[PDB]
Write an enzyme that holds these catalytic residues in place. Structure first.
Site, short mmCIF file in Angstrom:
data_model
loop_
_atom_site.label_atom_id
_atom_site.label_comp_id
_atom_site.label_asym_id
_atom_site.label_seq_id
_atom_site.Cartn_x
_atom_site.Cartn_y
_atom_site.Cartn_z
N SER A 87 52.60 34.50 154.45
CA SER A 87 52.07 35.72 153.86
C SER A 87 52.21 35.63 152.35
O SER A 87 52.91 34.76 151.82
CB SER A 87 52.78 36.97 154.40
OG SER A 87 52.64 37.09 155.80
N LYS A 88 51.54 36.55 151.65
CA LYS A 88 51.66 36.60 150.20
C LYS A 88 53.10 36.78 149.75
O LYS A 88 53.46 36.34 148.65
CB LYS A 88 50.78 37.72 149.64
N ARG A 89 53.94 37.39 150.58
CA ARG A 89 55.37 37.52 150.31
C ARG A 89 56.16 36.36 150.93
O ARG A 89 57.03 35.77 150.28
CB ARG A 89 55.90 38.85 150.85
N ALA A 115 50.12 32.57 149.37
CA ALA A 115 49.12 32.70 150.42
C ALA A 115 47.68 32.77 149.91
O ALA A 115 46.76 32.54 150.69
CB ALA A 115 49.40 33.94 151.27
#
Length: 459
Positions: A235-237, A239
């Site tokens: 995920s972006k956290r 991506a």
């Protein structure tokens, strides 16, 4: 006949690199087999699928060179087609209307086992009526198993008693994913459905829908999801595909890396785009998941920086030069920068940052560098280099190199006695690439002016 694949993202706001990898494999399968690659946007959710989110997908695919033969095709353009097929299934007795409330469906929570729909309305033949809970459900087979030979995962078999009469049309006038994707893949003659394996349990539901429709069933291939370094789902956290552009990775390098993530060819680790097309077969994809590895990607990017044509790297350097607000026109040609730095950096962002010294005046000197290399006596090397460089009829990396070697030979000194102070003269530091390129990249006017300043700073 002709191989036909598709990338069918639902727009979230950016292209995830998991989605890029899926597009890549579909693109490579089609290209290797001389077929067509179709771009479909699952955009029914009007909130998620803003025009900006669609443009992000399109811009990222353009950046990666993943051209599509057909599309983009929008699900919101196809609503009457979905309703036509749904209503024909009802008319043919293979789908039905149901009206149960959410709390009625919630009341089928009663596990004791696996949750599913009752099939209550299946043989009741209820007419269409105006009602906020009206759905159309497909009549899934009651018995037997669904079998398919996944191109990646092999033979998969699910019992039908584990499936139910899935909703295919929702109260809000939109199809469900399982219905729309089958109608779309059927209408567009998709021959190989290649997608992440979090969709694999919907495949037997889709296959039954193909067979109820009387549509040929495509082959399926399900790739394990990309994991992050720690082994969790990504995920972006790292991506967003555009983050890799901004970081200075070459598209072809990212593609070679993404291919190797879930695919292999012997012990080969580096693939040109042409090699990927030549070699790729979806059936050779790994069934086991792989983790991201930013270090491997940097290594991959170094190879492409080292071996791709200079003119292919150049526009990607220029992008980073412009990010820094640099007047590229007044400084060295970007191709010359690439030549001097391509073997010495990991990204084009790094290359651009290290090239700043040639695109702006020299104003800040490292004090320790001045102290080491501008001692009394350094003016002899500097003045000799200045004289020989000023007399060059042409200004090239090669001719600068000759002038600097002539300077050392004329003074009968080692090249270090020339390069060390010249490096501080040109850059204000004791860190630069090859001294001849470092001088050359300043241009003739700046090189002479900077050396003149250096000579005045000696002692």
């Amino acid at each position: 006949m002709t191989c036909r694949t598709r990338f069918a993202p639902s727009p979230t706001g950016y292209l995830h690199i998991g989605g890029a990898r899926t597009a890549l494999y579909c693109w490579l399968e089609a290209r290797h087999r001389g077929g067509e690659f179709v771009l479909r946007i699952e955009d029914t959710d009007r909130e998620r699928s803003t025009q900006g989110a669609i443009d992000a997908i399109l811009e990222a695919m353009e950046w990666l060179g993943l051209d599509y033969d057909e599309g983009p095709i929008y699900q919101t353009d196809r609503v009457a087609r979905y309703l036509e097929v749904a209503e024909q299934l009802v008319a043919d007795g293979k789908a039905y209307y149901a009206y149960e409330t959410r709390e009625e469906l919630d009341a089928m929570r009663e596990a004791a086992e696996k949750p599913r729909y009752n099939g209550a309305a299946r043989d009741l033949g209820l007419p269409r009526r105006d009602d906020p809970n009206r759905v159309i459900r497909f009549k899934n087979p009651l018995e037997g198993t669904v079998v398919f030979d996944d191109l990646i995962k092999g033979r998969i078999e699910i019992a039908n008693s584990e499936l139910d009469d899935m909703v295919i049309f929702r109260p809000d006038g939109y199809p469900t994913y399982n219905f729309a994707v089958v109608v779309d893949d059927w209408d567009m003659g998709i021959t190989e459905v290649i997608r992440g394996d979090d969709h694999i349990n919907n495949t037997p539901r889709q296959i039954n829908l193909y067979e109820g429709i009387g549509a040929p069933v495509p082959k399926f291939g399900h790739m394990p999801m990309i994991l992050d370094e720690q082994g969790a789902k990504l995920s972006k956290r790292a991506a967003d595909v555009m983050q890799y552009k901004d970081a200075g990775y070459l598209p072809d390098a990212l593609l070679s890396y993404l291919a190797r993530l879930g695919w292999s060819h012997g012990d080969q680790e580096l693939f040109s785009r042409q090699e990927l097309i030549e070699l790729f077969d979806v059936k050779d994809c790994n069934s086991k998941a792989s983790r991201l590895d930013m270090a491997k990607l940097g290594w991959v990017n170094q190879h492409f920086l080292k071996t791709e044509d200079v003119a292919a790297i150049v526009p990607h350097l220029v992008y980073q030069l412009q990010k820094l607000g640099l007047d590229v026109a007044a400084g060295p040609a970007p191709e010359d920068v690439v030549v001097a730095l391509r073997e010495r950096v990991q990204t084009l962002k790094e290359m651009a940052e290290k090239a700043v010294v040639w695109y702006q005046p020299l104003t800040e000197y490292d004090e320790a560098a001045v102290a080491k290399h501008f001692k009394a006596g350094a003016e002899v090397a500097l003045g000799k280099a200045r004289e020989l460089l000023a007399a060059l009829p042409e200004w090239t990396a090669e001719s600068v190199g000759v002038a600097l070697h002539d300077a050392a030979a004329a003074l009968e000194i080692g090249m270090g006695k020339v390069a060390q102070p010249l490096r501080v003269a040109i850059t204000g530091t004791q860190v630069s690439p090859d001294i001849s390129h470092t001088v050359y990249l300043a241009g003739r006017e700046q090189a002479l002016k900077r050396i003149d300043v250096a000579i005045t700073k000696v002692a």
